[PDB]
């Protein structure tokens, strides 16, 4: 029974590297830095039809179009600008779990409790949508999925485990594994050369796509983690978990920076982004209100609430212009 | 004020919209069933009589009624994560090998398979996502119970028991057993059914406990109740 | 995808007859529907136009109340019932697909024409008629339009199509700036309202032919006279 002990002084050594490591916290460092003050964001649209609850939304690379992913077993892809609705497509397993818009804008992924990733190809010739690809390979059902670009895909599952997938050949090049509870998120790092994965373990893992292996494990969370996004440099992440708190983790560092939690706020967190410059931390719950993070601060900086029920997904523009909450309640709105 | 190819975009949208409102018309007409239970309770076997890789769907009609029995036994992952799909489920039907209280769980760990089964409907039914959801229970392998019964006591699941041993008994007593878990009892209804080789009281018992619970969604929707 | 026509022939003055476009190969349903005349030594003219769905339809003011448009879906075809034929009804007939949602590409698609005899707004200006031109020089065709057709959108409604000796028009470009699907990178679109110029760099000999500009700001639906090029 040797491994139990060398295990834990491995551990130990990596604390004791992390605490020498920190020598400030974040907090008093941007005290002085002024607060952002109050951020009140108005609903200019709403998005109606899904008629089921939603679960998942993606903005495209442009800014004006976003694919939303219901229950109701509808991809409905959305004109934002005029609410117009540019695509509806029908999905086979209609228990969809999440959705991803290609960058180039000619795909559109999503899975669910089906344990396949169904890739859609936009710009048919015949001017429909057809399932280009259905890749299977996943013994759970896919919590998140996002594309490198038109043929690579990264999937995480419900069975502990992330995939790289070559959309042409429709198999898995590289398989993530190291995670002992579900993965329920990922997030690809602005230049797609390694990924971040939370999952059911209460740890998130930064892999590399290449390799193929977890380079970095960042444990603060107490319950779960149930969304991740990179921050907008591609140095940080932030985790929102069950626990009712979000976590801001810095890779090199390799440490939780601050944590984002008040008292009377209790409930989960459902999804997680950030604003352009990173300096707002948006993150949706359960207590159907979407609240806005000053990043740097740690302070509430501002509500955004019109929602009846749940926050499932929330996302905010690559210009950053807006943000899209999409909710239990079957509806789409950008705030601005 | 729109351009021409702005027009048509949005006579477009409501053409989708109208795809839209018929699917969603179709689909509420359309009932839902969630299976659940162990492997060998019986799934497979309902599912053949009501008949005649992930989620398995089952479409079948009844007396001018859609069911969509979706079976969930293949998903392996935490069940926290992934139950609330199924919060606005027309009902479950919970399924229960009665001739499970003398085999023991195949794993290392010595434990009734009967406990596991009753573990398992205890978190099922007490469940926050299944507050007034209805449970249709099916007790199958009846004959293998009665067989087994008078060939083993019932003593060996729990020596609680001090009844007679007989199938009735011990078969009503169970149900009891499995009843006695509601902890909402005025706002949850258990359909008992003690299944059966013929295929056509299976579908009825189903039938009729969905009735059941249309009628009350109707009379919630009426206000009445 | 293909687009079908017939119902052609000679035809007497003041009778009727009913062209039949069938279309395979392509969902007909969710496309709008066109008819472009071309009468034998002239340019293109819009027709008529049917919506998918048929929830909106629109005429040529020389054609409205004389011509009818209707569509059969679960036959994907596509019908121009016409009625008191005239000197001026002479024309080679296509139908034409549009599909009209943020990004697409209208026009893309030309069915291959049936004749038609009967033998007893925005204007929009090409400037130049014909022009000499040698495989490796850059070539530069002209349009201008009597209205603006910048909308406040941001979009530009000029559609650059090129019709080769014998063959059906196809669409070079849509908006002014997007190359159509399966079109070379050598061609280009640009300018500004009121102007427009489609650029060919690095010429080859399959782009000989007759270069038409059309907008689509508003319904008249106008096409240019032609800039056509030779060897």
């Known amino acids: 029974d040797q491994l139990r002990q060398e295990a834990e002084q491995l551990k130990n050594q990596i604390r004791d590297a992390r605490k020498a490591c920190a020598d400030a916290t974040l907090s008093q460092i941007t005290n002085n830095i002024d607060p952002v003050g109050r951020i009140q964001m108005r609903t200019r649209r709403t998005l109606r039809g899904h008629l089921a609850k939603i679960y998942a939304m993606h903005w495209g690379t442009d800014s004006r179009l976003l694919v939303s992913a219901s229950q109701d077993g509808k991809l409905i892809i959305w004109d934002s600008y005029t609410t117009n609705k540019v695509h509806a497509i029908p999905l086979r397993s209609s228990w969809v779990m999440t959705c991803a818009y290609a960058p180039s804008g000619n795909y559109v992924a999503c899975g669910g409790l089906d344990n396949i990733c169904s890739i859609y190809n936009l710009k048919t010739r015949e001017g429909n949508v057809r399932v280009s690809r259905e890749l299977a390979g996943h013994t759970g059902y896919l919590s998140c999925c996002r594309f490198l670009d038109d043929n690579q895909i990264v999937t995480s599952s419900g069975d502990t485990t992330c995939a790289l997938w070559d959309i042409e050949t429709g198999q898995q090049t590289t398989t993530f594994t190291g995670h002992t509870g579900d993965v329920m998120s990922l997030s690809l790092a602005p230049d797609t050369r390694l990924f971040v994965s939370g999952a059911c373990d209460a740890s998130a893992k930064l892999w590399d796509v290449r390799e193929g292996m977890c380079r970095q494990t960042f444990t603060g969370h107490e319950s779960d983690i149930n969304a991740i996004c990179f921050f907008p440099n591609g140095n940080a992440f932030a985790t929102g978990s069950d626990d009712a708190t979000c976590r801001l983790f810095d890779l090199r560092a390799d440490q939780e920076l601050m944590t984002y939690s008040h008292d009377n706020i209790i409930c989960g967190i459902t999804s997680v982004s950030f604003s352009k410059s990173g300096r707002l931390l948006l993150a949706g719950y359960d207590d159907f209100n979407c609240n806005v993070w000053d990043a740097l601060k740690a302070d509430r900086a501002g509500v955004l609430a019109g929602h009846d029920n749940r926050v499932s997904c929330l996302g905010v523009t690559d210009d950053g212009m807006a943000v899209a909450t999409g909710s239990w309640d079957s509806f789409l709105k950008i705030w601005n | 004020t729109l351009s021409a190819e702005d027009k048509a975009a949005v006579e477009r949208s409501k053409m989708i919209d109208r795809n839209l409102r018929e699917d969603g018309e179709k689909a509420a007409r359309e009932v839902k069933l969630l299976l659940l239970g162990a492997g060998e309770s019986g799934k497979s076997t309902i599912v053949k009589q009501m008949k005649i890789t992930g989620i398995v769907e089952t479409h079948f009609t009844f007396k001018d009624l859609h069911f969509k029995m979706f079976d969930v036994g293949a998903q392996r992952s935490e069940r926290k994560k992934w139950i609330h799909c199924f919060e606005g489920v027309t009902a479950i039907i919970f399924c229960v090998a009665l001739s499970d209280y003398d085999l023991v769980l195949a794993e290392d760990e010595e434990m009734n398979r009967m406990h596991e089964s009753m573990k398992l409907f205890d978190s099922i039914c007490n469940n926050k996502w299944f507050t007034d959801t209805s449970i249709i229970l099916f007790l199958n392998k009846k004959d293998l119970f009665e067989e087994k019964i008078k060939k083993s006591p019932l003593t060996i699941c729990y020596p609680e028991y001090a009844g007679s041993n007989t199938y009735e008994e011990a078969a009503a007593y169970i149900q009891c057993q499995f009843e006695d878990l509601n902890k909402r009892k005025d706002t949850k209804e258990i359909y008992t059914h003690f299944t059966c080789s013929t295929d056509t009281k299976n579908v009825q018992f189903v039938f009729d406990a969905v009735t059941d619970v249309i009628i009350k969604n109707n009379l919630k929707d009426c206000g009445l109740f | 995808v293909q687009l079908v026509e017939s119902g052609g022939g000679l035809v007497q003055p003041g009778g009727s007859r009913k062209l039949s476009c069938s279309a395979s190969?392509?969902?007909?349903?969710?496309?709008?529907m066109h008819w472009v005349r071309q009468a034998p030594e002239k340019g293109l003219e819009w027709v008529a136009y049917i919506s998918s769905g048929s929830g909106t339809i629109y005429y040529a003011d020389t054609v409205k109340g004389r011509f009818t448009i209707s569509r059969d879906d679960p036959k994907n075809t596509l019908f121009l019932q016409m009625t008191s034929l005239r000197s001026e009804d002479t024309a080679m007939y296509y139908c034409?697909?549009?599909?009209?949602?943020?990004?697409?590409?209208?026009?893309?698609?030309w069915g291959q024409g049936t004749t038609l005899t009967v033998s007893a707004d925005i204007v929009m200006t090409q400037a130049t008629s014909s022009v000499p031109v040698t495989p490796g020089e850059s070539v530069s065709i002209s349009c201008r339009s009597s209205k603006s057709l910048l909308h406040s959108n941001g979009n530009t409604y000029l559609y650059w199509f090129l019709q080769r000796p014998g063959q059906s028009p196809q669409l070079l470009i849509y908006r002014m700036s997007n190359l159509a699907s399966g079109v070379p990178d050598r061609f280009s679109g640009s300018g500004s309202g009121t102007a427009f110029t489609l650029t060919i760099s690095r010429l080859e000999a399959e782009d000989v032919g007759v270069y038409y500009c059309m907008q689509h700001l508003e319904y008249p639906l106008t096409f240019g006279a032609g800039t056509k090029l030779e060897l």
């Open positions: 190969g392509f969902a007909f349903s969710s496309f709008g």
């Open positions: 034409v697909r549009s599909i009209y949602y943020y990004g697409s590409s209208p026009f893309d698609f």
